[PDB]
Amino acid sequence: MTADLKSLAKRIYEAYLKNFNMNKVKARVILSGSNNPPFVIHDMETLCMAEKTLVAKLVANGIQNKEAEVRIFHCCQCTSVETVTELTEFAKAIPGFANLDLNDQVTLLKYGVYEAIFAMLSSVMNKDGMLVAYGNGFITREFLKSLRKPFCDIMEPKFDFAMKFNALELDDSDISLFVAAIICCGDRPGLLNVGHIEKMQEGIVHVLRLHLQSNHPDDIFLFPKLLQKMADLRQLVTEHAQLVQIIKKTESDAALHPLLQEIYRDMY
């Protein structure tokens, strides 16, 4: 007459497989090297070729098209908006989340979504570049570094995080629980029912700890390593939000999608 924590871990994993269009298995199949192979974006010529095939509407304007850096900024936001939708549906599988007040659900997702985004982003990155456009492009790390300031500063810290995160060799069953734990942080600003959220967090972290013990018997410190990665992600998001605000204020053509503007509003 006890919680079945192995069953819960499997439920979370199944919800992750159902709700996220990208996962580490899918990404690795593509990155390894037959249908729909990824178009490689390594310079301005190949960026523009990729846009004409994969986001035609964005470049179907005359000399009215935006600057390449602003077009990339827009494409990045589009993926974030879609991933926020996936994360919101995923969160329903977390025991207790759907029993919280709506306002607390909103607050947890508001602070958690970009931590989860950058954790899952790691799965589509290697040291040379990253998958984009639902696995149909691969944009090189060096090309993103070549963009004009400040746009060249967006992705490189995420690559830095990812290279170390990927060295932990998590699989999707681990990542699903890590993303659930990110969402269940009881110390987010503005929460109403802190006590119930702390209990929800305790439960999901217990599931995560036991799962890592079973799935990674070789790495006895993997759980505290991941606790530290959660704190690293919070700092990564804080710095990212600061850069997004600089771009919003100084780049008149770089607009922010209204759903993301609300996420960023009063966040840090």
- Positions in the binding site for ligand P7F (CB under 6 A): 22, 50-51, 54-55, 72-73, 75-77, 79-80, 83, 117, 120-121, 124, 132-133, 137, 139, 154-155, 158, 244, 260
Residue 2 or 36: the one with the smaller Cβ distance to ligand P7F is 36
Based on CB atoms, which residue is closest to ligand P7F, 57 or 195? 57
Work out how close the CB of 55 gets to ligand P7F at its nearest, in angstroms, rounded to a whole number: 6
Q: What angle do CA 117, 240, 101 make, to 5 degrees?
A: 55
Residues 6+ apart with CB under 8 A from 166: 122, 123, 125, 126
Measured from the CB of residue 163, what is the shortest distance to ligand P7F in angstroms? 15
Q: Which residue is nearest to ligand P7F (CB)?
A: 80
| Nearest residue (CB) to ligand P7F, 153 versus 198 | 153
Minimum CB separation of residue 141 from ligand P7F in Å reads: 12
Shortest spacing between CB 165 and ligand P7F, in angstroms? 12
Asked whether residue 80 is marked as a ligand-binding residue, the answer is yes
Distance CA 164, CA 186 (A): 26
The smaller minimum CB distance to ligand P7F, of residues 79 and 105, is found at 79
Residue 89 or residue 202: which is nearer to ligand P7F going by CB?
Answer: 89
Beta carbon of residue 252, minimum distance to ligand P7F (angstroms, whole number): 16
On whether 268 is known to bind a ligand per the annotation, the reply is: no
**Does residue 114 have a known ligand-binding role?**
yes
Output the known binding site: 80, 114, 264
Output the known binding site for indeglitazar: 80, 114, 264
